[PDB]
Design a protein around this ligand. Structure first.
Ligand SMILES: Cc1nc(-c2ccccn2)nc(NCCNc2ccc(C(F)(F)F)cn2)c1Cl
Ligand SMILES: [Co+2]
Ligand SMILES: [Co+2]
Ligand SMILES: [Co+2]
Ligand SMILES: [K+]
Length: 304
């Protein structure tokens, strides 16, 4: 394999971390290939769940806890801390909240969160690499509680970063927020990509095509598929009661991605940097509720 940039995996990985038996597990947790029965039963369907009040309560809870766990990771971002160390803290913080870390054994994903440094677009596997000053790093968190998943991510600066890094991270966040602002009943899912690409393209950045936002509730990933690029063929119309993510990945160079031999790590083909932000959203009559919002600060960590 020819690596596309400077990053390399840093092995070996510590043995899989156990989740105490008292924590409720998703179906895939014990499947040998980490396949999800309930997700496969819906493969290729485009119908979107309309959540009940019980569902919405369960989603509000798990999204709040997920935000708590992401803030835990945020507090650890400094030079010299390894992504494995972040994952360990994350793992323990999920368990302390009586939550299962959704990524763990999801299709055999080996860790409890995804850590995506620099040219890694998404699905970076926490490993022995210490973070370096100048790095940007996304941590993507998903928790499972009482049958519901809650999903968010932010990109962080490691010490002082260059102007390009600041512009990429700031722009990606703006893309996400401009998309969220358009969310309300009656809006087509395919419209969000028009908004995101319009802002990224205006700032000289490109929009990853191979990975999209997704429905999430009793399933980790489900309908609707939510592309982040312009003129896409996403199926469906927003309705009060829908829950889904918007999670744009934006790149310094071209949009093209490829996957490391580990089967997971998605990297830019040109080795240039990529950044990402994600919220889980509930569509309401007036617009939408940001279920994974920070509660005690107005801003994402990179600007606090
Ligand atoms: C964004 C994303 N992330 C992961 C993943 C896997 C391991 C760890 C973290 N994330 N896995 C994903 N999908 C796995 C395959 N399953 C599905 C199911 C439904 C859909 C959708 F299109 F949204 F309906 C997409 N993928 C996706 Cl879409
Ligand atoms: Co993912
Ligand atoms: Co996520
Ligand atoms: Co997501
Ligand atoms: K990245």
């Amino acid at each position: 394999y020819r690596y596309t940039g400077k990053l390399r995996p840093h092995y070996p990985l510590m043995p899989t971390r156990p989740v105490p038996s008292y924590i409720q597990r998703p179906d895939y947790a014990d499947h040998p290939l980490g396949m999800s029965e309930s997700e496969q039963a819906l493969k290729g369907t485009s119908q979107i769940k309309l959540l009940s009040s019980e569902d919405i309560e369960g989603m509000r809870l798990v999204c709040r806890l997920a935000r708590e766990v992401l803030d835990v990771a945020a507090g650890m971002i400094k030079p010299g801390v390894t992504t494995e160390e972040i994952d360990h803290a994350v793992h323990l913080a999920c368990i302390a909240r009586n939550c299962y870390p959704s990524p763990l054994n999801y299709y055999n994903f080996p860790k409890s969160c995804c850590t995506s440094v620099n040219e890694v677009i998404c699905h970076g596997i926490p490993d022995r690499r210490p973070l370096q000053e100048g790095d940007i790093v996304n941590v993507d968190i998903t928790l499972y509680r009482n049958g519901y998943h809650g999903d968010l991510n932010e990109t962080f600066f490691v010490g002082e970063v260059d102007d390009g890094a600041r512009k990429l991270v700031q722009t990606t966040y703006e893309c996400l927020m401009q998309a969220i602002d358009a969310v309300k009943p009656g809006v087509r899912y395919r419209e969000l990509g028009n908004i995101i690409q319009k802002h990224a393209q205006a700032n000289g950045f490109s929009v990853v095509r191979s990975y999209c936002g997704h429905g999430i509730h009793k399933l980790f990933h489900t309908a609707p598929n939510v592309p982040h690029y312009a003129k896409n063929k996403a199926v469906g119309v927003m309705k009060s009661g829908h829950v889904f993510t918007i999670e744009p990945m934006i790149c310094e160079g071209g949009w093209q991605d490829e996957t490391w031999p580990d089967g997971w790590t998605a990297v830019t083909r040109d080795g240039k940097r990529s950044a990402q932000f994600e919220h889980t959203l509930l569509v309401t009559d007036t617009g939408c509720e940001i279920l994974t919002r920070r509660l005690d600060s107005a801003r994402p960590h990179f600007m606090s």
